[PDB]
Amino acid sequence: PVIYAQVTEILGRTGSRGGVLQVRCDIMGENRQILRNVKGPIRVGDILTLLEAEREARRL
Amino acid sequence: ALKSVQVFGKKKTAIAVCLCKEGKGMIRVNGVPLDLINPPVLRIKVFEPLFIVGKENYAKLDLKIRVTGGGQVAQAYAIRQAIAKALIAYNQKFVDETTKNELKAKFLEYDRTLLVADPRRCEAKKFGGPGARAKYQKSYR
Amino acid sequence: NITITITSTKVKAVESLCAEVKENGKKKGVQVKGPVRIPTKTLRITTRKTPCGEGSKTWDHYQMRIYKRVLSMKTTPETVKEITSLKVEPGVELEVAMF
Amino acid sequence: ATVTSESEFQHMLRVCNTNLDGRRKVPYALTGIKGCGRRYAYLVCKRAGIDVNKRAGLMTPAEIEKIVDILNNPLNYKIPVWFLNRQKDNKDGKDSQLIANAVETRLREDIEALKKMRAHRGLRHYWGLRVRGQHTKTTGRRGR
Amino acid sequence: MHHFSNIKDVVAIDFIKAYAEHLKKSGKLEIPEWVDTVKTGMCKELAPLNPDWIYIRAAAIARKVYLNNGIGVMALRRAYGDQYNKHYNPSHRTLGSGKVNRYILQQLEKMGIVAKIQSGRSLTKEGRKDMDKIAFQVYKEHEAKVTPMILMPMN
Amino acid sequence: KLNNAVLFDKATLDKCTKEVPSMKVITPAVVADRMKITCSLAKILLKDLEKKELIVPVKVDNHIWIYTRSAK
Amino acid sequence: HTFAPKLFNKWSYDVTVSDISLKELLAINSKLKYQVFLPHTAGRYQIKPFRKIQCPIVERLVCCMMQHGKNSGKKLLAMRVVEESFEIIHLLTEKNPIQVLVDAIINASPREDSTRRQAVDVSPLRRINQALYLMTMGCRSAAFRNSKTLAECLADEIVNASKSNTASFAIKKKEDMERVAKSNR
RNA sequence: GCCUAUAAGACAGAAAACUUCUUAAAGGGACACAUUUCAAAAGAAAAAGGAAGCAUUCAGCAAUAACAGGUCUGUGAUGCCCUUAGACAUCUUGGGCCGCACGCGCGCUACAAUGGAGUUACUAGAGAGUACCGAGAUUGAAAUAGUUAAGGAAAACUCAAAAGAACGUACAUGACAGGGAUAAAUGAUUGGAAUUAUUUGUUUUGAACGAGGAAUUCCUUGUAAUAUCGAGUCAUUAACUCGAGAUGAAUACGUCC
């Protein structure tokens, strides 16, 4: 039901309180990149658990 | 006769002075056996230096530890340092080096604080607050 | 058996006096027991900085330090330290206590 | 773990014109008397020989009566004088015997006697203020 | 390993239980009339619940004379002391009731267990003899019941 | 509000003996809950069952009592 | 010659983790320092970022079991409570108590949260922290003013949250947050 | 010298070398040097080594200019004004500064079973002390406290931990044994004097309080938090402050909302 997205590299943060990072992640099953917003803490090697992959989280 | 070495371990304030000597495997802390340590839940923690390398490394060794500081849990960590160091120092003085290096390597790969003391100590209280960092409540209106 | 104890507020002063007694003890004296260093006494006083109660509650810390050294001789009761003064420096007190 | 006899367990026991919970043990149900507290209850049980671990609801009538007499005759039951509530009594007699519903009446009558005597402590009891000399500017602020 | 040399080699609470009943069977300890009407100190709010609280305390006081050379009554008062928390003020340490400690200490002198050091009290050769004789019995049962941690199976 | 038991009756004790040993985790807390008896009673009943050898102790201390079913 | 430390002389560390996203962030058996006789170590795991992942996972559960005013610094209490609860967990489910706790953490950790609102993912380290936070919080509330003991209230909390059971406080909280975030895309 | 062991020691009381611990002086020891990467440079981030690698941590001192910020009630520091023998000088006795319909601030104790109560073994650091100051030991006894009374101008004598821990078919979820206000009848301490309870013991009395609205405070590691010890004031009186150790969380390594 879920798919995993290994973190590639960290763009930065989101809304000025700075509690959410923007991380670019790639899915191993389809070698396809994606950009997601994550609730910290995170590191470069971490692998996420995504229940949705069509949401290109960009914050405009 | 009676080849012996002296070591010591430290915690916040606890100091565990040991005297590693040839014997039959008895370990005494302030005169009482290691199996009758007052905080009984911590006994297997104090005994873990024995099991990290095998009790046979202490079978021919008799210890006499004096602990005169700190609380009760701190003294448990001081004795852990004293027992682990006593084996290391003894094998350096009366045994060749490669045994000592192997023994200290086995201690290090499990827990570093077995042979090196923890440097953390209490911070001084500062005025305007009831502790080191906390401060009294501020009222405006 | 003779016992000497020197106390002062300056650490550098007693070390000079401890050395002097040991050096002086070659003649008119047989041996010079090493200076037993009694633990330092610290006299702390914490006081409010303000002559009134106004302002932030700020305190200031003062502390005196007392350095105590113990020397033991054999010598003779008549000879003792002889001069025993050597125009001793201000603030450094020497007393000689035999048995 | 034995099935108790149903006719033995009394949920209440009427001792000195007051009823006590039968579920509590003997000393802690004896605290239900207005004149007897915890320490007095433990001593009374020991003097009269009732087991301290038995439930009060299982007290036999013989034991219940043996509790009563010591309560209102404590001096002859080898109870120390300092253990008593009302020592050096007025109105003749020097026996306390305040383990009853008479503890408040003795308290009430003195205050009325103190009110008649018009002392400062008695006057403060009239006005309903703090009587033992405490600050009333900030505390004791029950709204009125 | 384990070897018996003195009372430090047995569990203190297990020894105190053993020394308590031995004084009971001996019967040389006299019970004061105020045994049930007192508490062990000012701090407490209830009298001791154990029926033989006198005998347990006597064993503990005897052990303290074994370990410490010369002990005064006041040192026992602070040893058996609680925290005074009867009001809104934060609790502070308080002494025990000196009468029960002095009485039991005096009683232990009657049975020829303790002595009169010029600055406290000590143990006697026969008092040491009985104390260690019971302690050795506690050591044997302890070893036959539990296994030593040194010989605890490797897991 | 619960006023569970205080002391035993024939009706509660018979079910106590028959079904308490048949559970997997037995402590004075649960058997008080299921059998509606005070936890002080649960200590008395569990001691008797241990003496009668229908429940085996896995952890008994001055802090908590845990027993369990015994089939051997 | 081959030292294999266990838990309190009863439980081993031969656990497997279903969630690969938490395999590296859980200190179970990858290193010898993670296998400890006691969940009591004085190591400094809060001096650098991502250092608490080096703490043994059972110890982390003990440290969170030390909450609110009059339970501050009573690690010996929380150690005893967890040790008693681990025996009950083994009795209830007849598995390795460590293994059940691994399954409880995986199944009682939200995978999606909302933040101003916008649905955002939950990082692997946050999932582990929130798992131990929700399980401990429910056990504390269940045992307050209750005849049951903390070890009893901790044991059933873990086993219920272990497989899927919604009676657990953690599972209720987890499904609540994910439902809110799902509507907050 | 005494006592128990299968076989080592324990304790008492001597008495001599010894210096790992302890004490305290002199030196030594980290400066990011050195590797990897990033930015020709200043530099930055791992990791290893190390007792120590955020400037190593916590503090002290801390520039220019300013407020008409507080104190003339600390000063025989002080200008001007006021009172100045029926005094706003000074002394004596009594009271008040504690007075309660209420409102606000700093705190202590609780609302319990991660608990209260009964017993048992415990384990620190930094303090302070005489021409009556800190008080050992012995006794009187239920407790406060009383009568006799060593050593100590002190690493020498006094001075001592409790949170926590261990024992039981104790308490079992109920304002109950959680809570200890309010009142009562009595025992003593300090004082020339204790009533408007100085402080405290005994027995009884058993109130709100079921985790707290709008709001708001402090805190990043031996830190918060929890409970205690010492000192300042102190004839007597800490819930206050200044320090000290005891156990040892969680949560970030961020961004200017």
Swiss-Prot record, chain D:
DNA-binding listed as a keyword: no
Pfam family, one: Ribosomal_S13
A cellular component term, taken from the record's GO annotations: cytosol
Subcellular location as annotated: Cytoplasm
GO biological process, alphabetically ordered: translation
Signal peptide: none
Gene Ontology MF terms: rRNA binding; structural constituent of ribosome
InterPro entries reported for this sequence: Rbsml_uS13_C, Ribosomal_uS13, Ribosomal_uS13-like_H2TH, Ribosomal_uS13_CS
Principal location class: cytoplasm
Compositional bias segments (type: Basic residues): 134-144
The keyword Thylakoid belongs to this UniProt entry's keyword annotation: no
Keyword annotations from UniProtKB, A to Z: Cytoplasm, Ribonucleoprotein, Ribosomal protein, RNA-binding, rRNA-binding
NCBIfam families xrefs: PRK04053.1 (NF003140)
Oligomer status and interactors: Component of the small ribosomal subunit.
Family: Belongs to the universal ribosomal protein uS13 family.
Function: Component of the small ribosomal subunit. The ribosome is a large ribonucleoprotein complex responsible for the synthesis of proteins in the cell.
Name of the molecule in the record: Small ribosomal subunit protein uS13
Swiss-Prot record, chain E:
Alphabetical list of SUPFAM superfamilies matching this protein: Winged helix' DNA-binding domain
GO terms under cellular component: cytosolic small ribosomal subunit
GO biological process annotation, one example: translation
Subcellular location: Cytoplasm
Family matches, as InterPro entries: Ribosomal_eS19, Ribosomal_eS19_CS, WH-like_DNA-bd_sf, WH_DNA-bd_sf
GO MF annotation: an example: structural constituent of ribosome
Matches recorded under Pfam families: Ribosomal_S19e (PF01090)
Assigned keywords, A-Z: Cytoplasm, Ribonucleoprotein, Ribosomal protein
Source species, domain of life: Eukaryota
Assembly, per entry: Component of the small ribosomal subunit.
Family of this protein: Belongs to the eukaryotic ribosomal protein eS19 family.
The protein's role, per its UniProt record: Component of the small ribosomal subunit. The ribosome is a large ribonucleoprotein complex responsible for the synthesis of proteins in the cell. Required for proper maturation of the small (40S) ribosomal subunit.
Name of the protein in question: Small ribosomal subunit protein eS19
UniProtKB/Swiss-Prot annotation, chain G:
InterPro entries, alphabetized: Ribosomal_uS7, Ribosomal_uS7_CS, Ribosomal_uS7_dom, Ribosomal_uS7_dom_sf, Ribosomal_uS7_euk/arc
One GO CC term, this protein: cytosolic small ribosomal subunit
Subcellular location: Cytoplasm
PROSITE patterns linked to this entry: RIBOSOMAL_S7
Record keywords, A-Z: Cytoplasm, Ribonucleoprotein, Ribosomal protein
Pfam families recorded: Ribosomal_S7
Domain of life: Eukaryota
SUPFAM superfamilies per the UniProt record, alphabetical: Ribosomal protein S7 (SSF47973)
Positions of disulphide bridges: none
One Gene Ontology molecular-function label: structural constituent of ribosome
Listed GO biological process terms: ribosomal small subunit assembly; translation
Subunit text: Component of the small ribosomal subunit.
Family: Belongs to the universal ribosomal protein uS7 family.
Function: Component of the small ribosomal subunit. The ribosome is a large ribonucleoprotein complex responsible for the synthesis of proteins in the cell.
Matches recorded under PANTHER family: RIBOSOMAL PROTEIN S7
Protein name: Small ribosomal subunit protein uS7
Source organism per UniProt: Entamoeba histolytica (strain ATCC 30459 / HM-1:IMSS / ABRM)
Gene: RPS5
